[PDB]
Ligand binder design. Structure first.
Ligand SMILES: [Fe+3]
Length: 821
């Protein structure tokens, strides 16, 4: 009756001896998928313990250990399709897999197994077979549904480290009212005032001063297997933000309070010095930073007084190129935030904001003042050569409250761009707008600034570009990055674990694209977007930052996240059935869009080849109970504040299923990579990507105006992010722009046996081959001299953000499967 099996596991001291696992320390019980008891449930075998350590196969790394085990299983017990496991040891271990031979049967587990007394029900694992609900072997049907009920929990209770309960809650855990009324923040989600995607429920309970806000916690829970261990401490990048906010930031502050370093940058060279000779800090400040995991990888040091940041890619060839109008415009199509620019089809541009509240909103930009390389405005409009980076309606509602803050002053900006005959974009005007209402104490007014290369006019134009980029950096960080990827994706991760069994084909299709997302999001709610957290203390909006993202979410549209839909909606492409991708770009050499369409196409082919393997007709999608409950919950609960919108796909057809999966995979992989991995490469020079502005343009006749004339670099530095928040911000984006060495990229999976279905495996193989094919093509584009203007620019920085592959580090390339940092 014996079945020879091999158990691979990792002792806790590996992701954060052997003989202790033997004896009666760990028992497994096989469950039959073909032979059932009197209740239709698969028969269960006897408790079998680990017999010995297997030291036979070389292919076994990652601090993993193999154990031999034999089960009493007669042919009459049917075929095993699952197993129970109980850990009698005090300390948890990481279960990798179980492999049964003559009968091969593989089980991919990758799950922490805590002491048996901590679990309400015994941990169960299934073989690597894939089944839509109606295809589940009858003896496993109930076990499948029971595991899902276990994962859903009951919606109450404080979640614990070892819990594996997935549920939703609103963002009511960012404020810290018990510490100070000044740290109170509006609850985001669950109201018409503040709609917002839901996040993972933690259940710590209410604060003492506000029943609607969740109390503080030293650890923000995520279902256990969402918290990724790492073999190398340097790869635990997500812990970096907590260390930065709680340990490093206070250390930097003391250096400034003690006046051990100049409080402000006084010249552009003071900024360049950070990645050259470095910055000198107090000994104890260096000593506080140098020993921390992850943090110590951010700077080179002499071990005593110096911290040196790495040279950002944007200055590696020319340290002054960022100041060119050419690079300013190019970064709108190949920079850190390449997805906001829109076509402009009328002139002057219009506003939908209420003039009764903000004053006359007519644009003050006159067509006759613009240099369109000889084109008349009507010619530029008609030839589709006019574009804009429009933050006017987005920022105007918040300008008054932001400008009331100390050290924060902004404009609601609009930039007009012209597509030159040579295919590059050039900036032709910037409008710096302020709201005007009766009784305004401020005398500052709106103004239009035009390009200028000499005189005070050139300084004013450089400052106008800085106000625009402060708007762009804020929108990029809070919306393009945080809202559209991190926050938007979490509800789908939760729904997937709550309603699609690990056996489900769609679960297998989508879960690789969720790796580390709930984990980084929980760490973000704790240290990145919390009251007085990193973002609030480094970006322009301060305490209004996260709520601004809620106002933007009001207009978030799931189907508009598809790349073709996005391009068409923004007026940078038109539908064209005669083209390979179904769309014709209006900026032919738009790096992000051109490379993105290649990746989008590859993902679509993959999804279109996968789905058919499990759903033959539209009725098969309509009748999948798990799939229907999954989608219904993702929409009505996860993104519930928008359940009233008409645009949600129905999921009653193969077409809709493909669409939904394609968009989810796109957001998690390529979209997030394109907006994330260029953060330090472009933003590592604070002048190129300022996060905040502290004053408006000066009045003629004041010393500030005189300063623009006599010391333009100081005028610029006094206007943008101060030195202290710059040091913190550079540190944060350096972490976010780094690829951990254990990352899993698009076209890869953590285990070659994720499914036993050879056809699904074949399809995945073709997808990976296609991505390698695409990379060769993108390499050719970057090497094409005719595309240099937009793909490299004056900074001579080849656009590699959508190259699928990458080695570890701050590489400016590589597409991870998920939002993993
Ligand atoms: Fe990210």
């Amino acid at each position: 009756h014996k079945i020879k099996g091999t158990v691979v596991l990792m002792p806790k001291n590996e992701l954060e001896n052997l003989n202790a696992f033997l004896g009666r320390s760990v028992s497994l019980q096989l469950i039959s998928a073909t032979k059932a008891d009197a209740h239709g449930k698969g028969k269960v075998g006897k408790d079998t313990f680990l017999e010995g350590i297997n030291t036979s196969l070389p292919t076994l790394g990652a601090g993993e250990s193999a154990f031999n085990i034999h089960f009493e299983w007669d042919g009459s017990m049917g075929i095993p399709g699952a197993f129970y496991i109980k850990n009698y040891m005090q300390v948890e271990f990481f279960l990798k897999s179980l492999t049964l031979e003559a009968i091969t049967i593989r089980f991919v587990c990758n799950s922490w197994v805590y002491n048996t007394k901590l679990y309400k029900s015994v941990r169960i694992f299934f073989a690597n077979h894939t089944y839509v609900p109606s295809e589940t072997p009858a003896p496993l049907v109930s076990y499948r549904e029971e595991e899902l009920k276990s994962l859903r929990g009951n919606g109450t209770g404080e979640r614990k480290e070892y819990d594996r309960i997935y549920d939703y809650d609103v963002y009511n855990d960012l404020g810290n009212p018990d510490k100070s009324e000044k740290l109170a923040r509006p609850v985001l989600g669950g109201s018409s005032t503040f709609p917002y995607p839901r996040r993972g429920r933690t259940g710590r309970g209410p604060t003492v001063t506000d029943p609607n806000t969740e109390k503080q916690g030293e650890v923000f829970y995520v279902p256990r297997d969402e918290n990724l261990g790492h073999l190398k401490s340097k790869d635990a990048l997500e812990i970096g933000t907590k260390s930065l906010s709680q340990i490093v930031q206070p250390a930097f502050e003391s250096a400034f309070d003690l006046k051990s370093t100049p409080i402000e940058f006084h010249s552009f060279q003071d900024v360049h010095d950070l990645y050259e000779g470095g910055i000198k800090l107090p000994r104890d400040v260096i000593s506080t930073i140098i020993p921390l995991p992850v943090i110590k990888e951010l700077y080179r040091t002499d071990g005593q007084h110096i911290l040196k940041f790495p040279q950002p890619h944007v200055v590696q060839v020319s340290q002054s190129a960022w100041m060119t109008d050419e690079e300013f415009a190019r970064e709108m199509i190949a920079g850190v935030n390449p997805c906001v620019i829109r076509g402009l089809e009328e002139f002057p541009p219009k506003s939908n904001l209420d003039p009764a509240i903000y004053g006359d909103q007519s644009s003050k930009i006159t067509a006759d003042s613009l240099d369109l390389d000889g084109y008349t405005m009507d010619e530029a409009l008609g030839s589709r050569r006019l574009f804009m980076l429009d933050y006017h309606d987005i920022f105007m509602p918040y300008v008054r409250q932001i400008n009331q803050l100390n050290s924060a002053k902004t404009y609601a900006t609009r930039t007009i761009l012209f597509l030159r005959e040579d295919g590059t974009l050039k900036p032709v005007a910037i409008e710096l707008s302020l709201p005007h209402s009766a009784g305004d104490l401020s005398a500052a007014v709106s103004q239009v600034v035009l390009p200028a290369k000499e005189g005070v006019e050139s300084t004013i134009w450089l400052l106008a570009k800085a106000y625009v980029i402060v708007n762009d950096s804020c929108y990029h960080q809070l919306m393009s990055h945080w809202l559209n990827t991190h926050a938007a994706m979490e509800p789908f991760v939760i729904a997937t674990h709550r309603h699609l069994s690990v056996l489900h084909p769609i679960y297998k299709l989508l879960t690789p694209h969720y790796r580390n997302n709930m984990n980084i999001n929980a760490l973000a709610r704790q240290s990145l977007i919390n009251a007085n957290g990193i973002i609030e203390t480094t970006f322009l909006p301060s305490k209004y930052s996260v709520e601004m993202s809620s106002a933007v979410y009001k207009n978030w549209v799931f189907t508009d996240q598809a790349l073709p839909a996005d391009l068409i909606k923004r007026g940078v492409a038109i539908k064209d059935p005669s083209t390979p991708h179904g769309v014709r770009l209006l900026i032919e050499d738009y790096p992000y869009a051109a490379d993105g369409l290649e990746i989008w196409a590859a993902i679509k082919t993959w999804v279109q080849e996968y789905v058919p393997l499990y759903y033959a007709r539209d009725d098969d999608v309509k009748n999948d109970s798990e799939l229907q409950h999954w989608w219904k919950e993702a929409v009505e609960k996860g993104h519930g504040d928008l359940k009233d919108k008409p645009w949600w796909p129905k999921l009653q057809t193969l077409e809709d299923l493909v669409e939904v999966c394609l968009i989810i995979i796109w957001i998690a992989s390529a979209l997030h990579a394109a907006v994330n991995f260029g953060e330090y490469p472009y933003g590592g020079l604070i002048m190129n990507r300022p996060t905040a502005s502290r004053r408006l343009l000066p009045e003629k006749g004041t010393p500030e105006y005189e300063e623009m004339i006599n010391n333009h670099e100081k005028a610029y530095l006094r206007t943008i992010t101060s030195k202290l928040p710059t040091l913190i911000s550079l540190s944060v984006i350096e972490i976010l722009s780094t690829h951990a060495s254990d990352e899993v990229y698009l076209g890869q999976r953590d285990n070659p046996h994720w499914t036993s279905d050879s056809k699904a495996l074949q399809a995945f193989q073709k997808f990976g081959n296609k991505l390698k094919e695409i990379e060769e093509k993108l390499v050719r584009r970057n090497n094409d001299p005719s595309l240099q203007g937009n793909r490299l620019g004056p900074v001579q920085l080849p656009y590699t953000l959508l190259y699928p592959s990458s080695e570890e580090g701050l590489t400016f390339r590589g597409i991870p499967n998920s939002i993993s940092i």
